[PDB]
Amino acid sequence: YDNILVKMFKTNENNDKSELI
């Protein structure tokens, strides 16, 4: 059981390394 792609869509869009840069 692994679903790393669904979790990485919302994490990378909102945060974007710092805060939406």
Q: Which technique was the structure solved with, according to the deposited record?
A: NMR
Cβ atoms 14, 20 nearer than 8 A: yes
Rg (CA), the chain: 10
In this structure, the number of other CB atoms found within 10 A of the CB of residue 2 comes to 4
Q: Pull the structure tokens for residue 18.
A: 């710092």
| Full DSSP string of 1-21 | ---HHHHHHHHHHHTIIIII-
Distance CA 9, CA 6 (A): 6
